[PDB]
C-alpha cells in the first residue's frame, strides 16, 4: 500500500515543474545568455565593453547600464 | 491480541506524521525520507 | 483531549472571526498590534489589516476552520483580499 503511492507523488511532482513552472524553459534560456549561445548578444555585449579599453568602466552607472 | 491492541494504538500518532507528506529493508528507508519532503514542499506552493 | 481543545477553540473564535485595533490621518485609524498575532497567521499579518481597511473607506461613503498542515484558511483569506481591493480600486476609477 506504500509503493503504489510513491510513484504517483513523484510523477506528479516532476510534472508540476514542467507544465506549470517551465523548468524546461529556464535551462534553454540561461544558455541563451550565460553560455552566449544567442548571437547578436555576446557580439553586442563584448563589443561594447571592448570599445573602452580603471576608475571608469567600474561604477554601476556604465556596466549596470550596458 | 494484547500486544497487537497495544501496537495498533502505539503507532496511532506516528501514522499522522506519515499522513502529512502524503531492521526494515533499506530499499524503502531512504525513499520515505524523500516521499515526505516533496509533500511538505508542495504545501508551501 | 484533542477533540476537546478543538471544540473550545471552534467556539471561542466565532466572535473574533465575526469582526487589529482601531482609533479615532488614515494610517493611524487601524494599526496592527504585534503581540496578539497567532504566529501561524504571521505570514499574512499585512493582508488582513489591508483587507478590512479597504472595506471601511467605502462603507462610510455608501467560514474559516483551523487545520494542521493544511492551509485551507490561509488560502481562504487571499480569496477575500483579492476582492476587497477590486471593489475599492474600481470605486475610484
From TrEMBL, chain B:
Organism of provenance: Homo sapiens
Quaternary structure and interacting proteins, as annotated: Component of the gamma-tubulin ring complex (gTuRC) consisting of TUBGCP2, TUBGCP3, TUBGCP4, TUBGCP5 and TUBGCP6 and gamma-tubulin TUBG1 or TUBG2. TUBGCP2, TUBGCP3, TUBGCP4, TUBGCP5 and TUBGCP6 assemble in a 5:5:2:1:1 stoichiometry; each is associated with a gamma-tubulin, thereby arranging 14 gamma-tubulins in a helical manner. Gamma-tubulin at the first position is blocked by TUBGCP3 at the last position, allowing 13 protafilaments to grow into a microtubule.
Listed name of the protein: Gamma-tubulin complex component 6
Gene: TUBGCP6
Subcellular location, record wording: Cytoplasm, Cytoskeleton, Microtubule organizing center, Centrosome
Role, per record: Component of the gamma-tubulin ring complex (gTuRC) which mediates microtubule nucleation. The gTuRC regulates the minus-end nucleation of alpha-beta tubulin heterodimers that grow into microtubule protafilaments, a critical step in centrosome duplication and spindle formation.
Residues of the full protein shown: 519 to 608 of 1811
Family: Belongs to the TUBGCP family.
Amino acid at each position: 500500500p506504500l509503493a503504489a503511492h510513491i510513484s504517483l507523488v513523484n510523477k506528479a511532482a516532476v510534472d508540476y515543474f514542467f507544465v506549470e513552472l517551465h523548468l524546461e524553459a529556464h535551462y534553454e534560456a540561461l544558455r541563451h545568455f550565460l553560455l552566449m549561445e544567442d548571437g547578436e548578444f555576446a557580439q553586442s555585449l563584448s563589443d561594447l565593453l571592448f570599445e573602452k579599453l580603471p576608475g571608469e568602466l567600474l561604477n554601476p552607472l556604465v556596466l549596470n547600464s550596458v | 491480541p494484547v500486544l497487537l491492541s497495544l501496537l495498533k494504538t502505539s503507532c496511532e500518532p506516528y501514522t499522522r506524521f506519515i499522513h502529512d507528506w502524503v531492521v526494515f529493508l533499506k530499499h524503502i528507508a531512504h525513499d520515505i525520507y524523500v516521499c515526505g519532503k516533496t509533500i511538505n514542499l508542495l504545501k508551501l506552493c | 483531549a484533542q477533540e476537546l481543545c478543538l471544540y473550545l477553540t471552534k467556539a471561542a473564535s466565532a466572535p473574533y472571526f465575526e469582526v487589529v485595533e482601531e482609533h479615532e490621518y488614515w494610517d493611524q485609524r487601524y494599526t496592527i498590534v504585534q503581540q496578539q498575532i497567532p504566529s501561524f497567521l504571521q505570514k499574512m499579518a499585512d493582508k488582513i489589516l489591508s483587507t478590512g481597511k479597504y472595506l471601511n473607506v467605502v462603507r462610510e461613503c455608501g467560514e474559516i476552520i483551523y487545520t494542521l498542515k493544511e492551509r485551507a484558511y490561509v488560502e481562504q483569506i487571499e480569496k477575500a483580499f483579492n476582492y476587497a481591493s477590486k471593489v475599492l480600486l474600481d470605486f475610484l476609477m
